[PDB]
Amino acid sequence: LHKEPATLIKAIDGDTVKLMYKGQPMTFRLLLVDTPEFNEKYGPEASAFTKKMVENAKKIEVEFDKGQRTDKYGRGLAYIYADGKMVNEAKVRQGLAKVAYVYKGNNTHEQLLRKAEAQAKKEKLNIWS
Ligand SMILES: Cc1cn([C@H]2C[C@H](OP(=O)(O)O)[C@@H](COP(=O)(O)O)O2)c(=O)[nH]c1=O
Numbered sequence: 452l453h454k455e456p457a458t459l460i461k462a463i464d465g466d467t468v469k470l471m472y473k474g475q476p477m478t479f480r481l482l483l484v485d486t487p488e489f490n491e492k493y494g495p496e497a498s499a500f501t502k503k504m505v506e507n508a509k510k511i512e513v514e515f516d517k518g519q520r521t522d523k524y525g526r527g528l529a530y531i532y533a534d535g536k537m538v539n540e541a542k543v544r545q546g547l548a549k550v551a552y553v554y555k556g557n558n559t560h561e562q563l564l565r566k567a568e569a570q571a572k573k574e575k576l577n578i579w580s
C-alpha cells in the first residue's frame with residue numbers, strides 16, 4: 452500500500468475523521484475498526500483518544516487498501532496515520548476499539564490489528580476490563 456498526504460479538517464468521533472485529501476474535504480471511516488458509541492461504556496474515552504491522536508499530529512497520512520475506497524455513505528475507507536503511527540492500530544492496541552468490518556479486499560492490516568487486540572486483551576485493557 453502507499454501513504455498520501457492530507458490535513459485534518461475535523462476529528463469527528465471514534466471511527467470518523469474529516470480531512471482535506473487532494474485539496475477536497477472528505478470524511479473517512481477508519482478501516483477494520485468499531486469504536487463504542489459515545490453513549491456506551493468507554494465511548495467518551497475512546498473518542499478523546501482518537502481525536503487527540505489526529506489533532507496532536509504534525510502530519511496526517513491517508514492509506515487506501517486494495518479494494519473499495521468509499522463506502523455506501525460516500526465515506527472514504529482508509530488506514531489513517533498520525534506522525535507515522537497508524538490510528539486504526541493504536542485504537543485497538545489500547546483497548547478502545549475492536550477489530551471489525553473485515554471485508555474481502557480491504558484486509559491488508561487485519562492480522563496486525565488482530566495482534567494488537569490480542570495484546571490489549573492479554574491486559575484486560577480498557578474495554579477488556
Ligand atoms: C468500516 C466499514 C463500514 N462499512 C459500512 C457497514 C455498516 O453499514 P450499516 O450503516 O448498514 O450498518 C456501516 C457502519 O459504519 P459505522 O460503524 O461508522 O456506523 O458502514 C462498510 O461498508 N465498509 C467498511 O469498511
Ligand SMILES: [Ca+2]
Pocket residue numbers: 466485486
Ligand atoms: Ca462505529
